């Protein structure tokens, strides 16, 4: 029993469109400033000169990447973002990996897609990171689904969806595309603060199931 | 190695007959009935939790049909060389008089995938309980096929599996009778 | 009768050690002559006859097509493996073992699945591989196999001949004896 698109509010549906069609992507940056033990502060390195606040789940994580060159990929937002100073603070959860851990050669992940049982065209996503966040992967799959199936448009025929990330090992991660946990990114994106990261070569594929 | 799953499909002209099926270590998992436009599982049980959209099959077939046209020309209309079948009639298990059994007609190593099979009890065509598989793929790109006739072993009976194929001059009649 | 023209397409997923090693082979066959193919181990199409040469280079030039065929090992092979695993890989059907008669003892082992099986003969608890003859592994076409394993003997009054069958459907070996 998947959540229905009709359970979301126009705002949630809007913030869903925004973050998956316009993720925040910065390559290689350092931060020597924790904030509240759970965040890493990258001053003036956010959109339009804004200071960026990358929020994590536990202090251990923010610690792990402090003082290191990292890559950033993930949903960004402002509303409800704790301010750090005079300048505006842009927030993002997890989506952090070490800039130096890049794959030998680019990795291509295939994604099967069905709509009410009908097999559709296969989709492709790539990454050259040796370790990529589930967020980066989720966002890239949702972008395609957004353009191809109009998943976050209020009046589209799709009302239910499930994305499955299969690992070569019998492991499997999944998301109900309409099971957002609120209408604000500040709430919605807390799902990524664990900064879950996968080994790109260990990944097998993605299965997408949508329903009208 | 361990296992092999094969998605096999073909289109034949001028018959305009096509096929689409899945194989697992030599056994059919399912095929799509081109006419009915429904997928048929080899054992009903398979259809309980696994499913396949027959629509997906038809799409593929339309392309196969189109490629056959292209290869027919590119090859200068060189036709296929008939390869008559090897027909063998086995029994499901050791026959014992009056003990239920199944006559198996194994049609093998042939091409093209077009065949006309008939079971004959004491010289009469039979239909009572007869079943069959679709054409199965061979690594030599030839085909396999199975037909079945459940029966009750008797001394008063004789069976025959008649197979007709273009690479055969006369039909190939393989006989079976209780050997006492 | 009319000349036939045949087109075949086969996607073979070879699995080694569960799903650890996977090899995808996409084969194109005109009539009975394979013309081009995609071998996941090669990473791109290769023509097997001059006829496929046009198709291999036209297809290899479409990046997204090859990215797709390369990833098929996972999205296709591995995926379909997990789909039917419960009723193909895990399928287990116990064989029905029977034993019956210078003599020729017959050990009938039928209706079992998978095809992997061991059938040993024993004369008074001592194995005998000599003089042993068999039909080989017969595939019935219905997701079951059969086989007859015979032993040529000189049955002396008192000897005990046993047929032992080792098959995955049963933890401990199956044995049926015959008293001479």
């Amino acid at each position: 029993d998947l959540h229905d698109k009709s359970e979301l509010t126009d705002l949630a549906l809007a913030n869903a469109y925004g973050q998956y069609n316009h993720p925040f992507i910065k390559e290689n940056i350092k931060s020597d400033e924790i904030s509240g033990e759970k965040d890493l502060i990258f001053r003036n390195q956010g959109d339009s000169g804004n200071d960026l606040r990358v929020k994590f789940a536990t202090a251990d994580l923010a610690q792990k990447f402090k003082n290191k060159n990292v890559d950033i990929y993930g949903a960004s937002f402002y509303y409800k973002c704790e301010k750090i100073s005079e300048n505006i603070s842009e927030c993002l959860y997890g989506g952090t990996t070490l800039n130096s851990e890049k794959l030998a050669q680019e990795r291509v992940i295939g994604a099967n897609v069905w709509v009410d049982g009908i097999q559709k065209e296969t989709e492709l996503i790539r990454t050259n990171k040796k370790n990529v966040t589930l967020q980066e992967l989720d966002i890239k799959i949702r972008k395609i689904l957004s353009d191809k199936y109009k998943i976050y448009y209020k009046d589209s025929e799709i009302s239910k969806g499930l994305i499955e990330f299969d690992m070569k090992t019998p492991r499997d991660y999944s998301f109900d595309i309409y099971d957002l946990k609120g209408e604000n990114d500040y709430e919605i994106d807390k799902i990524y603060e664990d900064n879950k990261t996968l080994k790109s070569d260990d990944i097998s594929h993605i299965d997408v199931n949508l329903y009208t | 190695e361990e296992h092999v799953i094969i998605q096999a499909e073909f289109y034949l002209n001028p018959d305009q007959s096509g096929e689409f099926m899945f194989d697992f270590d030599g056994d059919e998992i399912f095929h799509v009935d081109m006419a009915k436009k429904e997928t048929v599982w080899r054992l009903e049980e398979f259809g309980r939790f696994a499913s396949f959209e027959a629509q997906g099959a038809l799409a593929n077939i339309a392309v196969d049909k189109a490629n056959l046209e292209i290869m027919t020309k590119r090859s200068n209309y060189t036709p296929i060389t008939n390869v008559p079948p090897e027909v063998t009639v086995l029994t499901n298990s050791p026959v014992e008089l009056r003990e239920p059994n199944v006559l198996i007609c194994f049609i093998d190593k042939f091409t093209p995938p077009v065949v006309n099979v008939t079971w004959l009890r004491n010289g009469k065509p039979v239909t009572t309980g007869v079943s069959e598989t679709v054409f199965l793929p061979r690594e030599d790109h030839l085909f396999r096929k199975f037909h079945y006739l459940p029966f009750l072993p008797s001394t008063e009976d004789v069976y025959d599996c008649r197979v007709e194929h273009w690479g055969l001059d006369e039909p190939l009649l393989k006989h079976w009778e209780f050997d006492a | 009768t009319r000349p036939r023209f045949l087109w075949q397409l086969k996607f073979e997923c070879h699995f080694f050690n569960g799903t650890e090693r996977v090899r995808l082979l996409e084969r194109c066959i005109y009539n009975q002559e394979e013309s081009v193919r995609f071998d996941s181990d090669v990473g791109e199409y290769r023509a097997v006859t001059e006829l496929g040469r046009p198709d291999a280079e036209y297809w290899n030039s479409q990046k997204d097509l090859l990215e797709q065929r390369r990833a098929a090992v996972d999205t296709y092979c591995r995926h379909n493996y997990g789909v039917g695993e419960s009723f193909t890989v895990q399928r287990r059907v116990e064989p029905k073992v029977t034993v019956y008669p210078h003599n020729l003892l017959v050990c009938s082992v039928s209706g079992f699945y998978p095809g992997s099986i061991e059938v040993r003969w024993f004369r008074n608890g001592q194995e005998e591989k000599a003089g042993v003859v068999s039909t080989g592994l017969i595939q019935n076409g219905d997701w079951t196999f059969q086989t007859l394993v015979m032993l040529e003997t000189v049955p002396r009054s008192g000897e005990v001949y046993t047929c032992q069958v080792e098959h995955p459907s049963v933890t401990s070996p199956l044995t049926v004896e015959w008293r001479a």
Binding site: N112, W114, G117, Q119, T122 | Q7, E9, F22, I29, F30, F49, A50, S51, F52, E53, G56, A57, A59, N60, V63, D64, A66, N67, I70, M71, R74 | L9, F11, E26, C28, P54, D55, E57, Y58, W59, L65, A72, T75, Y76, H79, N80, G82, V83, G84
Partner: peptide, 13 residues
């Protein structure tokens, strides 16, 4: 669980 098919390609002309 659904079986996925591999799409057949159009031959060159």
């Amino acid at each position: 669980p659904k079986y996925v098919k591999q799409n057949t390609l159009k031959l060159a002309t």
